[PDB]
Symmetry: D2
């Protein structure tokens, strides 16, 4: 008698004992007479083409795979609801926030960043925390991480950053020279790197970590007034981390530790939950903010910008088929219902394009008609047609052009976007040296105690150890810019690692 | 007031008059505020990425097209039912023939062969007549033509034949040298070419032609007893042809003559129907048959093997969305319910591989989950999993391996196929010199009268004249092998056409 | 003996006449022993799987087709050169214009707009005129039409317009009600529609029509100064059109009239050529221009902005394999070498995204690695890696991330784009009511003579007659906004055809 | 200084030291002026579509992934040559064996079977060992394992078997009951399962293991005489394994232990070499062989059928780009040059279909035109045309149909297959009850010593304990069917694991 996950097949048989097993059929529904023996000429003769039973199964096996996610490939999924606990209709007119008590079905995916489909869960890396809201004003995808910040603040460095985080193009091995050459040349990453190599770099499962929308977003109320915001969904189960000692053992003992823990939790009625908060910044407060309010490498301090609670996230359902419901999950930051809008955040702007595009590649042009991705709580009506694997009535014989005098769907003026005024030059602005150390200086000295600062440099030194000396001296110098003792600790550890 | 086809949008709006038009939404279900004006900076400024309304629409527009069919690309569709009128249960145990009165939902596609998506309907070519039967034991695709025979009798020559009937690989033009160089090198085409260039080469729409399964098929009844058979669909609307003169006029006046003719018919309640007949040959009679009974270039003469009535095919429903319902239609001759099986027809054996193969490319690995391709009157249960665009529960948490101790689907031993034993060396047997002339001589002398043979040579000479003299003399000689006068009539016209 | 098009294979054999025929192989290069006969057990036995010769040919045949172009599917191709004849280096620093006499290889594709792969060439429609310049600064794609203007001025209407021009989503028929309903609700189409329905709507082949960039572009010289421009590449063969009477005859007599004609021309040494002009507008003149200089439904009058000659485009080579060379051609308006840039033209803005997107769908992620699409006169080096069907060294073992301390490719600061200043509310500005008639009024009264206007109304009336009366009366008033006699001439024709 | 693998970028820079960095261009070859900062409106403004530098970079990143291999996903690659050292031309007429001393370029891929792209290398599993021979008669793909046998002997069980070895359809976890539920229901796997859980289940890298073709193949010499054969390709480095103790440790310390080991070896001049042997069975010996000579779960004993040496395979070159050269490597067992032919092995027959099929999905229809998949030592000439991503001239304007009178490729009668005679009922013959225990018994009793048997049982029990008890005792029952002492040593241990 084992954990509920391993008893998956066992329960399925029990859940069906009263029923008789179905007739085994071909993909076309034709009953198979025998599926253990190939159609051959004589007992030791060759196989026939006429064996259409064989081909139909064999061919589908051959196409079982789809391209994995280009980032965050290793993933865990769950389902539940979002429930409003406070009224913030003064900030957002989004129906998902309409009144206290309102529930919205959600879909959540947890993931790592660099690891592939088969990688270990208990490794040092950021963690994905994507949430899909099935609202009546369409689907809302809040694709956030377990950190309030990221390593870079311009989307043009994202493909580069990821490459450096993955495998060498010739050797196909993880190479720390790629890792630290990038990080040391781009000191803006100092903030997020400090987070990653801290205790929270290896969370104890998916239920013991916080989530952040990271990006500054725009909220718009009914009168047409707008504010900026941050999304924080903090763990109700409490922050708990794994030791570098306990994370490494698990890496071979249970590669899918996070997958198994989440599944076991929900299956056993122990439902994990998060409390959704926001921070709010007025357009006025945005212009006087000491840093760039849309810099993804920046946080909003809690003292100046307190958390305003909105609701609860509860995961109370395990997926039924992992592939069909979790691996085919597609999240689009461009999915924003009326009342929630993007800020001019350089990184967020890039994500508005990238995600729908990649889903059309990874899953298909009509990925939005896949059940788990469908906005099934909205009525989709538009002038979009066809595409590979078209799955519904394709909107019937409805007029497919707009405008028309034949009463096909109409635009909704209520859903017009907030109008902002901008001015300046149209060119590429250098953002590389906005203040990269001040908030990092704050994190190191004020948030961490002396013991965590000690482990922080150790985790850093242990990985920086593999880079060339010129990359090392560059990294240490970048760290010294945060705090001299911080920089001197890492290199002090390095002088011991270099024998 | 006009024909029903053109009034489609008019009728669509009338059908909705009580309702108010829907809110125009994105694929993610988010209402759009305006879909007539782009998000720009100032009235004459640049476009913004944060405008996801444009991208989501445009990106979908970009992927509207899927590969057209490699052959029979130009198509017309309709739906209806198959109804059993006579008892043929002594020959087949197939549920589709179970008792008199039995109805099966069907799907029919009509097509030409060589023309691409935009070509004219009224051209000389064979015609497709594919019928999809939605039976309880899965789908039955009886994929037939308007001819009992074909141009070739070996599956390895099919790509070649097709290439020769389509466009020249350099000029992208129809090439008479490609067409007849082939035909003259493969005299077996003499039978079907004679059919093609007769009156029935250009049918007056799809409602005035017969359809044939062409292939000899196998029928197996409840006792496991087997016979060979042919399928015949004779028009209840009567054979009716176009003169080449009026077919040519319609080619520019109405490129979609056959498509609209069908649509207008059904919409005005005038439902087209065909009468299903069979011919039956016992294992005893097959071996004493003068020719190869599985030779696709051979008919079974009515004198020896008369038609046995089975039922009626009735088309009484038009497609609602052509693309979702007719362009994504997939017929697999390999889709055969218990009671219907393949003969050793070299060509039919080849078709068992090709169609499922091409559909996985054209539509996708999971093309059978598309509504019109789905066997919705049967329960698909098997150990096939995953694949791109997985659309249902993916059969849940059911055990995905076979055999298993967990009550996942089981084979059904009753649905085993009839067992025949075969022998001779396993080798590549030459089929080039089976009787190519006897049945053709028969067709020329017995079935055609003096005026139709006269037009037959005129229709042939009119096309062969564009081929080189060495090809003409080669083709004519093949026609001379059929009948001296047949060869001599063609050469008489060619000498005038050659100036 | 026949035209060069018909003798393609004939010449192919003679051009090879000295050599022995090559060994017929599988895709894996294995020689075939027999490709006319299937491997079976006994002369009348079932086909074997062990026949991998059959499978390999058939499997490839099954995948011969790729998704056709969403628009401009019916096409003719040629290759040649662009030669600079005049000096415009004071306007553009682009290498393609560097000195007089300089030649650059080009590729040209001709197309209609609405017709599918099999549709007729000689129909009333705009004509595609895409030119790809293989410059040292990368490829330059000038994707223009045979008209200086278009039907719409916002990219959000393009999917709408196209749908209206193609087949009904239910009946799959061309629908005059769809066609004019769009046009009548959108009077901005009045300009281009006026072009389309008089003589130049049906050009006599591809060599007797002009080409236009239509869009306003930006030119930037060595001093960093910018101007706006229009591209006109006018035919050296002279404008020549087909009458409605016989253009219709060719639709059925020779569906590929332009396809054959273009091929025949080059092969017989008559190389077609076009003379490239530009028009130039300063930023200052853009500010005083009476209309929106980026309204695609507007021309720059020759009086105000005279043509400046640049060079010749000459097509002097026929393609060798149509598919590999013309069907796989991908033109990207986003392909612009340093010195040539986009204006804030809304329609042009949309094309920057749309074209690269669909090409990744239609052809593939690595579509730029296809020979005709490859920038073979430039050195492609970047941090792009992998993707489906990667065909080269994949840039070797070079570092794939940027920045790096390992001497991977570097930015070229000179190649930065022009800096413009923009400001205004970020909002969707209504352009629906920009002047729709003035330039149209000018075209009607000043450019056309009395019979061309008479023929113009006939062609419109001949097409509009099939639409509903409310659509007719709506359209006529739109035409009346151009000129009272114009609307009334059309209306005089409609009242008798409506019996 | 570090291992050669880690110094890849260091060395890349050195090889380039004289050179200055390339001009960074778009995929279309246009140089980019700045690729670190985005095109925006104002320093803190929104992103523009006009930034095509960004869009195309992101879009290509979005499409970097292709479906990983459905099996054998985790892989290592190397290149070298095959050298003939002995004469076996009396057995085979294949050009790869034509004379002593002859060298042929090879491509090798090493792999696990079940693990995905991110899985650990040092796990208990079979090892893939594929060799691609680039012969003048086309490519010869010898797709073998590190075992002479397999778990099953019929192709219809392969997809089922694989699923059981992979992840649970709901929980997405490795599931021990799935593994053994299958294995215990199919006792033929006892042989391969016995091999797997012995020392050689976890080899010390890829250079310390043997390769086997496993399948019986056919050899044909010039006289048309045929023999059956097994390929045994033995390591020159000697068998060397990792204990499970350090194999578990290496699993988290170095996920790509084998990948790095292979690369490091080749880079340091330490070239791995293996010796190719064959076993030969005459048609006469096949009829008297006590077991099925085509049973993939059976070996040919060395005593009756001694090893005949053929040549050497040597790997002396590392890949330059892993993706282009190793991840896109495609092996087809159906790729067989004249002189090598398939036996009637049920499993091998299935693989003729499966591999070409899956590659058309994974890589593309035209995957054989990929450099590493291309038969560059052969001339591909045939009548195959078009398809997505066509990369050469597509065989020019050559005639695309066969037969033809225009001197296109001709079949080569020399390349006909060996002709065999067969007889029997065409039916599905049951292979479940061929002798499943005898050859396993000798391995346990005669080949293993007393300590290896002890560990064999420990490793099984260590893994089998996780399955349900009803599954365990059934599996244990199979082990006792091999030998009573073998079964209960295992059973003594499971009962210890059952607390
Ligand atoms: N046996 C068959 O299935 C067919 C036979 N034939 C040809 O007729 C010869 C004799 O057949 P037999 O059965 O002995 O005598 P029949 O006269 O009974 O064969 C009559 C068949 O010829 C068909 N037919 C009549 N005119 C044409 C035409 N212009 N183009 C194509 N088909 C036409 C009829 O179609 P309908 O059924 O509408 O009268 C009928 O099916 C055969 O050798 C064969 O070549 C022709 C078609 C099929």
């Amino acid at each position: 008698n084992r954990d509920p996950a391993s008893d998956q097949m066992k329960h399925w048989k029990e859940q069906r004992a009263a029923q008789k097993p179905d007739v085994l059929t071909t993909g076309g529904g034709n009953p198979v007479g025998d599926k253990l023996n190939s159609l051959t000429v004589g007992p030791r003769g060759p196989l026939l083409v006429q064996d259409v039973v064989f081909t139909d199964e064999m061919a589908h096996f051959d196409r079982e795979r789809i391209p994995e996610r280009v980032v965050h490939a290793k993933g865990a999924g769950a389902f539940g609801y979002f429930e409003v606990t406070h009224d913030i209709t003064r900030y957002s007119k989004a129906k998902v926030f309409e009144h206290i008590g309102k529930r919205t079905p959600i879909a959540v995916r947890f993931s790592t960043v660099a690891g592939e489909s088969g990688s270990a869960d208990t490794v040092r890396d950021p963690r994905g925390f994507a949430v899909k809201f099935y609202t009546e004003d369409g689907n809302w995808d809040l694709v956030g991480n377990n950190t309030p910040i990221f390593f870079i603040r311009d989307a043009l460095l994202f493909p580069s950053f990821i490459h450096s985080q993955k495998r060498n193009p010739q050797t196909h091995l993880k190479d720390p020279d790629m890792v630290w050459d990038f990080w040391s040349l781009r000191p803006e990453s100092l903030h997020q790197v400090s987070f990653l190599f801290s205790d929270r770099g290896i969370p104890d499962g998916h239920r013991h970590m916080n989530g952040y929308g990271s990006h500054t977003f725009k909220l718009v109320n009914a009168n047409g007034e707008a504010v900026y915001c941050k999304f924080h969904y903090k763990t109700d189960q409490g922050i708990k981390n794994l030791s570098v000692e306990d994370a490494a053992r698990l890496a071979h003992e249970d590669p899918d530790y996070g997958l198994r823990d989440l599944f076991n939790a929900i299956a056993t009625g122990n439902y994990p939950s998060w409390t959704l908060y926001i921070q709010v910044m007025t357009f006025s407060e945005a212009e006087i903010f000491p840093f760039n309010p849309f810099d993804l490498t920046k946080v909003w301090p809690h003292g100046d910008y307190p958390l305003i609670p909105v609701g609860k996230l509860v995961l109370n359902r395990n997926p039924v088929n992992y592939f069909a419901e979790v691996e085919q999950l597609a999240f689009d930051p461009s999915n924003m219902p009326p009342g929630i809008e993007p800020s001019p955040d350089k990184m967020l702007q890039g994500r508005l394009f990238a995600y729908p595009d990649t889903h059309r590649h990874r899953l298909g042009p009509n990925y939005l008609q896949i059940p788990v991705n469908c906005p099934y709580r909205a009525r989709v009506a538009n002038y979009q047609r066809d595409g590979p694997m078209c799955m519904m009535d394709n909107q019937g014989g409805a007029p497919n052009y707009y405008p028309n005098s034949f009463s096909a769907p109409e635009h909704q003026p209520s859903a017009l976007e907030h109008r902002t005024h901008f001015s300046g030059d149209v060119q590429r602005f250098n953002s590389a040296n906005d203040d990269n150390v001040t908030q990092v200086r704050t994190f190191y000295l004020k948030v961490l105690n002396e013991e965590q600062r000690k482990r922080l440099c150790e985790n850093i030194a242990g990985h920086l150890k593999d880079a060339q000396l010129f990359i090392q001296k560059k990294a240490v110098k970048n760290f010294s810019d945060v705090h001299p003792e911080y920089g001197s600790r890492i290199q002090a550890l390095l002088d011991k690692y270099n024998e």
